[PDB]
Design a protein around this ligand. Structure first.
Ligand SMILES: Nc1ncnc2c1ncn2[C@@H]1O[C@H](COP(=O)(O)OP(=O)(O)OP(=O)(O)O)[C@@H](O)[C@H]1O
Ligand SMILES: [Mg+2]
Ligand SMILES: [Mg+2]
Ligand SMILES: [Mg+2]
Ligand SMILES: [Mg+2]
Ligand SMILES: [Mg+2]
Ligand SMILES: [Mg+2]
Ligand SMILES: [Mg+2]
Ligand SMILES: [Mg+2]
Ligand SMILES: [Mg+2]
Lengths: 151, 76, 77, 65, 116
RNA sequence: AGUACGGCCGCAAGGUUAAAACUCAAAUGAAUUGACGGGGGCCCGCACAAGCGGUGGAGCAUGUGGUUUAAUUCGAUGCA
């Protein structure tokens, strides 16, 4: 994308809840283009989060997400032979793109049982600032502060 | 490996090697220790004990796990 | 130097619904956790809170009051 | 160089050092010598300046903008 | 101790480091802080943010004297040339007059050779 | 080869004067069209960056190299 600029691509909303937020989350963990299966998993994983939390469907999905989305993240920015990295603030629309990713990646580890179960554990951990997904944020959050000299 | 305070009487020179040995160990390791510096170089998770038979499992070394334990909100 | 052996089963310890309590106070109340291969775990807490007895449950030294514990399959403890 | 700053200022804005003493003065003193690369520099550093007067006089052209 | 009212801030900004030292009127030091000692060992200490933290720490460890009024004397061209003096303002010091005391010979001693 | 020998000069470093045999069919100067630069501007593109999924390990299918064989027919050998 040197000359080009790209506006956006439209996404179908989630069927139970007319929110585009839960619609992209289904896409991220969907593999081999199997949208039905990944949609079942998210529904079998957020059904329990209503049971545990008290918040029902999206305030419960938001609250777990909100403790995982970052504020800054770094990149390699060599100048003329340098090799260091520069912390750069991230736009509000890439936050959820990174936040959902980290949850699903950490869910594929920690193998307990069916994905609908081990994802349910990871989502509930992020509702408490407890799981791996939060640690991945703080690991980035430290490295962005340890290199704060570059800005 | 199960270690109930493996570094009680060891000096730091011998303890330094044990930190490197246990770190590189490929297999499973469950270790118990009451000091701070030693668990920041060998372990990546904690099972922090609480009263009433409740165990809270946090992620990271000692200091990282205690960090999540300040910010706990316990899923209202 | 350590003596590495063949890789253990992917599940080392699995215990769910396990709740063991000494006469007076509860040491472990409705535990549910898993220990996978190559996972390094540190038990920490206060004095006399059951760290040494928790390992005893894992190796089957003393029997859990309830909940059942399943052990790994190619372990060399 | 010195700024008394008077009573109300609330902000530095010390561009007063840019006149006179600054890293511009010290750069020539950081190192070097050679006693005649200055005469290579000062000959180049003004041969170019007059060559810009030729290009500045080269505005007598349509150039159609 | 000695509850000195008015002091002077010396900043030795350099191409590699920046050393902040707070003194009274008559050249008696009271405390200091550098970029390197503030956890910036390596190539990071040559950046104005590291210079900010050096004056952040030097604002402390001098508060025992309760230094309210401050003069600033800046020496040497380097990154942390204005970052340190903005840090002292946010540290709560009143600044009266800023100075430049960079030493420039009138063609005195011979500098080093050159680096190729 | 600004070298050898010989003069003159110098404390020395060395300076000045100054060859020949031999060997090559060229050496050289300025400019032209290209190519090339770890030279400079402007523009690009799955080239990086942001991502998804693989190869390299395992078993098998197919082709090649080598080695064997009475013959393992011939051809294709960086990108291509
Ligand atoms: N043989 C025993 N008979 C009775 N009570 C026991 C016995 N062994 C341990 N206990 C009790 O069980 C509880 C846990 O003991 P345990 O040995 O597991 O402690 P711990 O958590 O490892 O602590 P510490 O770090 O102090 O050794 C304590 O209340 C202790 O008094
Ligand atoms: Mg030098
Ligand atoms: Mg001669
Ligand atoms: Mg000569
Ligand atoms: Mg001679
Ligand atoms: Mg890439
Ligand atoms: Mg293979
Ligand atoms: Mg042929
Ligand atoms: Mg062939
Ligand atoms: Mg042929």
């Amino acid at each position: 994308p040197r000359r080009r600029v790209i506006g956006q691509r439209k996404i179908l909303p989630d069927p139970k809840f007319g929110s585009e937020l839960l619609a992209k989350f289904v896409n991220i963990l969907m593999v081999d283009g199997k949208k039905s299966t990944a949609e079942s998993i998210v529904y079998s994983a957020l059904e329990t989060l209503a049971q545990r939390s008290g918040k029902s469907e999206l305030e419960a999905f938001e609250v777990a997400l909100e403790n995982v989305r970052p504020t800054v993240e770094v990149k390699s920015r060599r100048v003329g032979g340098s090799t260091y990295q520069v912390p750069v603030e991230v736009r509000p629309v890439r936050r959820n793109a990174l936040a959902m990713r980290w949850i699903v990646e950490a869910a594929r580890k920690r193998g307990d049982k069916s994905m609908a179960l081990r994802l349910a554990n990871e989502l509930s951990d992020a509702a408490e600032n407890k799981g791996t997904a939060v640690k991945k944020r703080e690991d980035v959050h430290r490295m962005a502060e340890a290199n704060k000299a570059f800005a | 490996l199960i270690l109930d305070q493996p570094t009680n009487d060891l000096d730091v020179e011998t303890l330094e090697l044990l930190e490197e040995l246990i770190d590189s160990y490929q297999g499973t390791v469950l270790l118990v220790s009451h000091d701070r510096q030693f668990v920041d170089n060998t372990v990546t998770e904690c099972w922090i004990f609480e009263g009433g038979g409740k165990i809270g499992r946090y992620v990271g070394g000692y200091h990282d796990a205690r960090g999540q334990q300040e910010q706990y909100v316990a899923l209202k | 130097q350590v003596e590495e052996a063949s890789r253990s089963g992917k599940i080392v310890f699995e215990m769910e619904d396990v709740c063991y309590q000494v006469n007076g106070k509860q040491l472990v109340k409705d535990f549910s956790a898993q220990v996978l291969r190559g996972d390094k775990i540190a038990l920490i807490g206060p004095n006399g809170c059951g760290k040494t007895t928790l390992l005893k449950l894992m190796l089957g030294q003393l029997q859990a009051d309830s909940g059942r514990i399943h052990v790994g399959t190619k372990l060399e403890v | 160089i010195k700024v008394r700053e008077n009573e109300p200022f609330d902000v530095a804005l010390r561009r007063f050092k840019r006149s006179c003493e600054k890293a511009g003065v010290l750069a020539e003193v950081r190192r070097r010598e050679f006693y005649e690369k200055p005469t290579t520099e000062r000959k180049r550093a003004k041969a170019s300046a007059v060559k810009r007067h030729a290009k500045k006089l080269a505005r007598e052209n349509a150039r159609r903008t | 101790r000695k509850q000195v009212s008015d002091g002077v801030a010396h900043i030795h900004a350099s191409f590699n480091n920046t050393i902040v030292t707070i003194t009274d009127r008559q050249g008696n030091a009271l405390g200091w802080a550098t970029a390197g000692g503030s956890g910036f060992r390596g190539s990071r200490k040559s950046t104005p943010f590291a210079a900010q933290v050096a004056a952040e720490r030097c604002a402390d460890a001098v508060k025992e004297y309760g230094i309210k009024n401050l003069e600033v004397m800046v020496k040497g061209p380097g990154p942390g040339r204005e970052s340190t003096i903005r840090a002292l303002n946010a540290a709560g010091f009143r600044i009266t007059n800023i100075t430049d005391v960079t030493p420039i010979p009138h063609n005195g001693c011979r500098p080093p050779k050159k680096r190729r």
